[PDB]
């Protein structure tokens, strides 16, 4: 088939799920890509379908701050999704490395994140699993680009129509509406931007507990705050944005487009 003809593998970049990621090159073009190789003799009928939901969505999304999918290929034994190569590692690791970001940096990172989210939403796509692990950095340089990945959890919404699309995502990043098993829509990803922006600033999330139940109780209640001495020095504006992102009521929450106009994003 068409993949083993046109591309040529090199080093493993990642493991996780049944999915091995490896650097590759189109032998005509000379152009490097990231290839997500999925073992398929290990995978059911509907989970060949769940994976083709994923391709179909990556294809709807052309953005500077979204990992572009360049071509999906079903060979007998394996599937290859062919992504933009992005070497900067996870934002997660970069936060850990640097402990926290400057407001200047956080502002420049979340800006790119929100722009992507905005685009995702206008295309009727809700990520549902935003977190610094699903955010890849272009290079490690102290400002470089940030792109979204793992639409493996991503849903299609018709308009601002809310609905129960089920209970999925990462515990820390879950919205109050999702935990309550209420209907939900685009805003569940601005909650995640809340968590992420908070992390981006001070090195730890606004909600945590080793006992999962206590965690889900913290989220529902919207029980975060700004501990001293770290938040003592952080602009009232920054806090404000986080407060409008971590609003419990989805309707009263800030939207991606709103968040991009907020003073801590556009100054001068």
């Amino acid at each position: 088939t068409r993949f083993t003809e046109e591309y040529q593998l090199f080093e493993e970049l990642g493991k996780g799920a049944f999915s091995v990621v490896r650097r590759c090159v189109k032998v005509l073009a000379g152009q490097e890509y990231a290839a997500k190789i999925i073992n398929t003799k290990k995978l059911s009928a509907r989970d060949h379908q769940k994976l083709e939901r994923e391709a179909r969505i990556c294809r709807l999304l052309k953005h500077p701050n979204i990992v572009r999918l360049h071509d999906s290929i079903s060979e007998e034994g394996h599937h290859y999704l062919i992504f933009d190569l992005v070497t900067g590692g996870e934002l997660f690791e970069d936060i850990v490395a640097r402990e926290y970001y400057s407001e200047a940096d956080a502002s420049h990172c979340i800006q790119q994140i929100l722009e992507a989210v905005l685009h995702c939403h206008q295309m009727g796509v809700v990520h549902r699993n935003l977190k610094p692990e699903n955010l890849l950095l272009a290079s490690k340089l102290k400002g470089a680009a940030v792109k979204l990945a793992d639409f493996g959890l991503a849903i299609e919404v018709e308009g601002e129509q809310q609905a129960w699309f089920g209970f999925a995502g990462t515990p820390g990043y879950l919205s109050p509406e999702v935990l309550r098993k209420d209907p939900y829509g685009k805003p569940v990803d601005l909650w995640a931007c809340g968590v992420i922006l908070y992390i981006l600033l001070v090195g730890y999330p606004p909600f945590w507990d080793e006992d999962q139940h206590r965690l889900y109780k913290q989220i529902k209640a919207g029980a975060y705050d700004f501990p001293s001495p770290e938040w003592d020095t952080v602009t009232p504006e920054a806090k404000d944005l986080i407060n409008k992102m971590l609003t419990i009521n989805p309707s009263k929450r800030i939207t991606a487009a709103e968040a991009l106009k907020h003073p801590w994003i556009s100054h001068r």
Binding site: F92, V96, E133, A168
Partner: peptide
Amino acid sequence: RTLDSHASRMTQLKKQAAL
């Protein structure tokens, strides 16, 4: 268990799986 210090809080930052 976390102290009441920035650096102790910063250990709450853990990778988390989906579901």
